[PDB]
Amino acid sequence: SGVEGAAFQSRLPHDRMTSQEAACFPDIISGPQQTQKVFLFIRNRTLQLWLDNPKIQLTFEATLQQLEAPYNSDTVLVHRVHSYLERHGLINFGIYKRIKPLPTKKTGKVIIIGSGVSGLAAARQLQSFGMDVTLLEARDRVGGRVATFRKGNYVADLGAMVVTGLGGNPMAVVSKQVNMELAKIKQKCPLYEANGQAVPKEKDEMVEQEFNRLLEATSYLSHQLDFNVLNNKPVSLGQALEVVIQLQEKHVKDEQIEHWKKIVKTQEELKELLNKMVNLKEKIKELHQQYKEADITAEFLVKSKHRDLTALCKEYDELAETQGKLEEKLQELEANPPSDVYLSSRDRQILDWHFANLEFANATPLSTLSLKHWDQDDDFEFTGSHLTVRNGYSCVPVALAEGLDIKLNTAVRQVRYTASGCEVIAVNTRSTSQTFIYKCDAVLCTLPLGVLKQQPPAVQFVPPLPEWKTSAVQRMGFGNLNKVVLCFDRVFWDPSVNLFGHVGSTTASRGELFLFWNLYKAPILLALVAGEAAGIMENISDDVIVGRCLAILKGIFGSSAVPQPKETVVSRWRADPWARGSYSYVAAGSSGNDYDLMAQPITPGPPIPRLFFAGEHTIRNYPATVHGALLSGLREAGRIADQFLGA
Ligand SMILES: Cc1cc2nc3c(=O)[nH]c(=O)nc-3n(C[C@H](O)[C@H](O)[C@H](O)COP(=O)(O)OP(=O)(O)OC[C@H]3O[C@@H](n4cnc5c(N)ncnc54)[C@H](O)[C@@H]3O)c2cc1C
Ligand SMILES: O=CCCc1cc(F)cc(F)c1OCc1ccccc1
């Protein structure tokens, strides 16, 4: 349906009130059910008006004018619902044409640290709400971990590049607003072994299905058997995977043992039976001779010796009947051995590609992921196919930056917050002698988790952050993932596949250049460096790592088919001082709850909150994504306006 679709697209149940709405509308939840349905229709229709045209501000008046009778008669309720949706960034978010120009006198000063998607999303909200907002950004550009390389006709994303399903995804709104060219990813992903040979289809399917089985077994261990703690330590996904593989190997060795036992027993029966048949020949050879050694007692002696001879001969033919039914049982047993091994050496390498793919998705070696919680956010996945941004994902933060007071090359060094306000201290990155002091009423910190983890600290908080916050910072995972960009003047790969895989030769290096992406107008290939390889490869120069790419590609397509690239770029996110990694993951011994602790604002002791937090590491249901960063900025903007302008 139409207004039901609008609730779904807003990640809301179309036919009941959320807890958040119950808090804000307690008179509605406690009142008659009929009025609750009116509330839900006003809410849903208001979201539909916005989602149907997110390029213009949806005002209260225009909401009222487009509601059909009887709904356009309860002016007060319509206003209450519009204001609530607006305050929480469910309408009039992103970048859109303002109908109401900005208030000329501001109310409250907010310093936002960092001009990534979360800081930008919050900044636009707070500016719409009539506040004085300034973003301090250490880089010479906006976007943070959205970072697009552009040169000539080449476009390639070094940070985020994939939009997950559009159903429920706020990026569907921003896409319409910014005019992103999205393109669905084709799922075919052929694999090539380290010698460049294609993986045969049957081995590809067999190994992939084994990967699915092994992973489901860890989830059974975790969520049915509650094997999550061992020797007082949290179990990791990698650790659980090693256990389920050990049991598969045990199973192979057992069935092998059973099979050898069947062989041996059959051999022993034949050995015994032949020995018995031997003695029966000796017994018949002795009688067959006493049949030639030969009257009335003689005419009856032949009858008796023929009766005796041919009975042993019938005994012997029957034993040769069992002799065949045994050595034919032996013959098919030797021809049907169970498997020698669980995984052939090549099978294992292929299985390690699927693990590498998973270390890509989580940005970290599997031995670091929480067995119990590594996928705690699964239930919030959007619907629809995934897409890539053919024109470069930077179009989103560049569009969101329009009209904001943004200070580039301005690195925050110290954040001071008291019950009387805040001071942010920053230095010019092009001239670190120049110092700046920004006074404000509130600070919104969107610093990446990697920067918050840095010891000694990059940014100093005065007073120091509370222990409950720093230990959450300490527990949470912050992973790494890197990309080599290869720009050619000609397409030598299969233009109709967006993905192909390189199967590494060893487990430890399985994430090295394991996945290639064909996404762009110009002849560009992105290769991923995942897992353990991601951090280690940053110590390799561009030319050497490009050379290793070209060797892989020369192995797959032929040495003469691969020309030298015209441009190359290599990300080093861990070594990047303004990121120190790629994105959070749920570390063993962490949980979703640490994401909630990260979102919690700080209040100076006895008072009102001064220091606020946004960023991909602060949103439990959508971590490590652009849409999660965006949603987190909208959330903190609502919280800050509630504090400084009233709920
Ligand atoms: C390699 C890679 C691949 C990814 N792929 C997937 C994908 O395809 N799709 C997806 O949805 N997500 C993906 N992500 C994750 C996604 O990009 C991030 O979750 C999101 O961009 C983070 O936004 P943020 O606002 O939380 O942080 P950021 O974008 O990092 O914003 C924080 C900002 O603070 C700035 N800053 C740092 N230190 C200081 C300081 N001292 N003073 C001032 N400013 C400072 C930084 O420069 C930055 O601009 C990927 C990320 C990376 C790096
Ligand atoms: O390019 C960087 C990948 C960024 C990323 C980080 C996430 F936490 C979740 C994602 F959806 C995602 O991007 C698409 C993706 C989906 C599944 C498996 C791997 C990647």
Side-chain angles (χ1 to χ4, degrees), residues 158-164 185 357-358 360-363 377 381 386-387 481 483 517 528 583-584 616 622-627:
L158 303 170
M161 61 186 175
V162 174
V163 180
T164 62
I185 301 157
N357 196 45
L358 190 54
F360 152 50
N362 290 276
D377 54 315
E381 275 167 6
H386 294 187
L387 317 94
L481 171 78
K483 307 181 183 182
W517 296 69
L528 305 189
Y583 43 87
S584 62
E616 56 89 4
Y622 304 99
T625 60
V626 174
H627 54 267

Side-chain angles (χ1 to χ4, degrees), residues 222-223 228 370-377 586-587 590-592:
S222 195
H223 302 283
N228 293 297
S370 166
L371 169 60
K372 190 182 198 196
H373 300 298
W374 72 273
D375 58 351
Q376 57 90 29
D377 54 315
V586 192
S590 191
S591 70

Side-chain angles (χ1 to χ4, degrees), residues 313-463:
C313 286
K314 181 163 161 291
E315 179 172 5
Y316 187 106
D317 284 315
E318 183 190 334
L319 293 177
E321 189 182 291
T322 303
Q323 183 184 221
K325 298 304 302 175
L326 280 179
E327 63 200 334
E328 177 162 48
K329 183 185 185 184
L330 178 64
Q331 194 43 49
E332 53 84 20
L333 275 156
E334 298 156 320
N336 293 263
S339 312
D340 174 33
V341 300
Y342 174 50
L343 293 169
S344 82
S345 174
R346 290 175 45 194
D347 293 333
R348 172 66 211 214
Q349 290 161 335
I350 297 172
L351 175 62
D352 275 333
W353 183 93
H354 293 276
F355 292 144
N357 196 45
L358 190 54
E359 302 185 312
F360 152 50
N362 290 276
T364 192
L366 302 194
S367 60
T368 65
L369 284 168
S370 166
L371 169 60
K372 190 182 198 196
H373 300 298
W374 72 273
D375 58 351
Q376 57 90 29
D377 54 315
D378 249 13
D379 284 325
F380 304 98
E381 275 167 6
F382 300 138
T383 79
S385 170
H386 294 187
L387 317 94
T388 49
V389 187
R390 209 157 154 94
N391 68 319
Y393 214 151
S394 64
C395 65
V396 160
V398 167
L400 296 175
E402 185 203 317
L404 300 180
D405 183 13
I406 304 178
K407 311 283 184 196
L408 298 173
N409 306 306
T410 305
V412 173
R413 286 319 177 200
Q414 168 176 127
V415 179
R416 326 176 61 94
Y417 56 99
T418 63
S420 62
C422 312
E423 283 184 352
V424 184
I425 295 84
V427 302
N428 188 2
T429 63
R430 311 295 205 211
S431 173
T432 49
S433 51
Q434 217 187 352
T435 299
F436 308 105
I437 319 301
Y438 299 91
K439 301 167 184 172
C440 55
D441 306 298
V443 174
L444 177 58
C445 172
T446 76
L447 293 168
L449 182 52
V451 170
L452 297 172
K453 283 174 160 292
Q454 197 177 348
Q455 308 290 333
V459 185
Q460 183 190 354
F461 293 89
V462 183

Side-chain angles (χ1 to χ4, degrees), residues 86-89 92-94 96 98 110-135 400-401 404 443-446 612-615 618 628-641:
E86 185 168 52
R87 170 61 53 94
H88 290 70
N92 306 333
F93 70 92
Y96 54 88
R98 291 179 204 287
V110 185
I111 291 291
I112 302 186
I113 309 181
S115 187
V117 165
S118 75
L120 290 162
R124 293 202 72 84
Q125 292 303 102
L126 292 178
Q127 172 184 254
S128 294
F129 297 162
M131 303 191 68
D132 185 351
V133 186
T134 298
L135 297 94
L400 296 175
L404 300 180
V443 174
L444 177 58
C445 172
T446 76
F612 301 80
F613 294 91
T618 73
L630 182 113
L631 289 168
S632 83
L634 302 186
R635 172 197 76 214
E636 290 312 310
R639 201 203 301 264
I640 288 165

Side-chain angles (χ1 to χ4, degrees), residues 149 154-158 161 483-495 497-500 513 515-528 546 549-550 552-554 556-557 561-563 565 567-570:
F149 170 80
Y154 304 122
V155 180
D157 271 313
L158 303 170
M161 61 186 175
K483 307 181 183 182
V484 181
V485 177
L486 306 173
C487 305
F488 303 92
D489 62 357
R490 66 183 59 109
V491 176
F492 59 87
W493 52 91
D494 189 348
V497 313
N498 300 134
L499 307 163
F500 57 92
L513 297 176
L515 185 58
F516 288 80
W517 296 69
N518 158 34
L519 302 180
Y520 301 111
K521 168 258 176 191
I524 307 175
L525 287 188
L526 316 190
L528 305 189
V546 164
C549 282
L550 296 180
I552 295 178
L553 296 160
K554 284 183 184 201
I556 297 168
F557 301 97
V562 181
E567 312 286 342
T568 62
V569 194
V570 183

